[PDB]
Ligand binder design. Structure first.
Ligand code: ANP
Ligand code: ANP
Ligand code: Y90
Ligand code: Y90
Ligand code: MG
Ligand code: MG
Lengths: 352, 352
């Protein structure tokens, strides 16, 4: 059957699909038309229906997997549209992770003779992350950081080597946030999590601005000034709070200037969008910092699709983690950050 | 002069005023009419102007302070109205803390010959907290907790002894949040803080519901169902996430159900108010838990005026801290929780 791994999250389904490129003359004959139809449908289209997208820039080319050569593809669509996906399927052994592997188990079994194997999401995350870093991103680094994140005229994306990846703090920013401490390939734990994640950004942003997509929320945020909504240390002290080394620009109270009616009446949608992004991002960084200090881990890698096409939040994490840790922690990022669970699920295929 | 301590915060001014009750016959003669006017104005009124309030239930009666007996009064008004207060004053040595002791220093000096002594807010907090617990609340405990916070038919306020108060984690919930680690009477530090505090509750609540006061925000929240806005673990998994011991009722994504337009169209203002309260309160508890674990401190005391007339948030903190710490941390509360800085400032009077 086709080789897939699927991560069904609260918001997005992520699918990794291995396309064989070493099909022999005989193998092409002994392939049933439905399979050929699936393969050409997936490789000849970049949009699937109205909401499915293949992230072509992420494709791993000429990967050797399970003794075959092929291309590894990365595909996403909203969990809300999983009924369409399953209905297309009713027109295979499926390794699946994420909460939806449990929630929609019975729905996947409406596909006759389909074998569903549920795999744990944080176990799939770690395996897929380590795997993709190991094979490289088509010879480039999978992992990167922002050099000189405190100086904007210097701040720039730079590769980071994870050849000895342990220990590692993994911050998975999906709908919510899970924080993992990875000590070895088989020794890892979920430290804690936070409820203020990507779904909070998008949910609050939609309530406050009427935006109707993640991308629109980011576009608004890019044009806004969060300090129109937030109360800063300098709004309370008139300057820095020197005694505890708090700079005047630090946010003392997120949305704290919105207690004044006249400020609520002058704030723009874009300002609110940016304050929402800054609020969520700073809280993620601060929780990550506290977990890193507690776990005695100085490398903090951020994954999940909150950071997809979201350089604002990545740069804010890079600057804030370095600034508030006095340079003791470094923020790391991965090119395939939304897809590690799906890859880890695909990697469980030989166990079945 | 009258004995005052003042804490000028980002949102509220808190004032502690010592009323002597041992005035002798001669002392009453040698008292100038303006002073007599101030004392009778403060003791014969409970509302001052349109926005000042004396919290009569908090009064400490027949306290011995600086070798005199008197009553200690607790008074609050919005920082926005400090210009009115200063203008009334222009119709004394003032010990003052909070960010506004710095920001409004020049304004206080418009009162002729007034000596302003700025004192550090976290230093005043610790001194005032330890002092009030030491003298008791008119013979009752200043400190309390909620017994059996996990069972609602049993949950009840109970006194807690702080006679050896160290070590102590103090979580000061004002506009934002400061977290203090107190190891002794003279050994304490600010561990960290969070920007998601009382001003975030009130600012977001006002944006989302149009409420026009803290009390109205709490009244709305009391009638709402936060699960109409939040995405829970059971919304993602269909039940518990057993592998990591996450119950189905845990919030996976605050406001995470608001990414769906039809849910934004059915959610009530009250639901949004409660989701705002729950979001802020859970984040405060979770940050407090992480700091307590890092500081190796198991007693966590919550202060500041976010918790004033706010039993919902107190009970949520009590339950959440006990539940998520598996009973290793206990949430503590103080009857005079908004006023410790003002008291600590008053206690610095003999140094000048
Ligand atoms: N096209 C998109 N649609 C929706 N959300 C998007 C999109 N692109 C990025 N995001 C963001 O990515 C988040 C979801 O990230 P993701 O890692 O896929 O979480 P999930 O796995 O679906 N949720 P979870 O069950 O908590 O692990 C959303 O909350 C948004 O902030
Ligand atoms: N009458 C009220 N008016 C405004 N806020 C209130 C009131 N009663 C309670 N609150 C809450 O109490 C918070 C302020 O608490 P408080 O401890 O007085 O902070 P502050 O000292 O003024 N701010 P900060 O400079 O950060 O220390 C507000 O954010 C509200 O959530
Ligand atoms: N990555 C990462 C990362 C990102 C942010 C972060 N912060 C920790 C420090 N903060 C704070 O104390 C926020 C704060 C709260 C209250 C006050 C009172 C007026 C005195 C002042 C005041 F500043 C702000 C948030 N930590 N880490
Ligand atoms: N006092 C105190 C206190 C209050 C709350 C608290 N929480 C820590 C545990 N939380 C979490 O992991 C929140 C969370 C995030 C993501 C997910 C993913 C679907 C799997 C699931 C998921 F549950 C919730 C917040 N901790 N302490
Ligand atoms: Mg996920
Ligand atoms: Mg204060």
């Amino acid at each position: 059957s086709p080789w897939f791994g699927m991560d069904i999250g609260g918001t997005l389904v992520k699918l990794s699909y291995f396309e064989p490129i070493d099909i022999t003359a005989e193998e092409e004959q002994e392939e049933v038309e439905s399979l050929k139809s699936i393969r050409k449908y997936l490789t000849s289209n970049v949009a699937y229906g109205s909401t499915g997208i293949r992230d072509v820039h992420l494709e791993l080319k000429d990967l050797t997997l399970f003794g075959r050569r092929g291309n590894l593809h990365f595909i996403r669509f909203p969990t809300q549209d999983l009924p369409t996906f399953i209905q297309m399927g009713r027109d295979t052994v499926l390794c699946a992770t994420g909460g939806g592997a449990y929630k929609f188990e019975k729905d996947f079994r409406t596909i006759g003779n389909l074998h569903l194997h549920k795999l744990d999401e944080l176990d799939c995350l770690v395996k897929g992350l380590l795997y993709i870093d190991s094979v490289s991103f088509n010879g480039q680094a999978e992992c990167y950081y922002f050099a000189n994140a405190s100086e904007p005229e210097r701040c720039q994306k730079m590769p980071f080597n994870l050849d000895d990846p342990y220990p590692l703090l993994v911050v998975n920013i999906g709908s919510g946030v899970s924080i993992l401490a990875v000590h070895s390939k088989d020794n890892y734990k979920r430290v804690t999590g936070t409820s203020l994640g990507g779904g909070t950004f998008l949910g609050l942003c939609s309530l406050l601005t009427g935006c109707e997509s993640f991308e629109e929320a980011l576009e608004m945020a890019s044009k806004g000034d969060s300090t129109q909504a937030d109360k800063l240390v300098r709004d309370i002290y008139g300057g820095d709070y020197e005694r505890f080394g708090l700079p005047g620009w630090a946010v003392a109270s997120s949305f704290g200037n919105m207690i004044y009616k006249e400020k609520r009446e002058s704030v723009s949608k874009e300002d609110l969008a940016r304050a929402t992004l800054v609020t969520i991002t700073n809280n993620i960084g601060s929780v990550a910092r506290m977990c890193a200090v507690n776990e005695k881990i100085n490398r903090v890698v951020f994954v999940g699709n909150f950071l997809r096409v979201n350089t604002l939040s990545m740069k804010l994490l890079a600057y804030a983690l370095d600034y508030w840790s006095k340079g003791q922690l470094k923020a790391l990022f991965l090119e395939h950050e939304g897809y590690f669970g799906a890859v880890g699920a695909l990697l469980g295929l030989p166990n079945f």
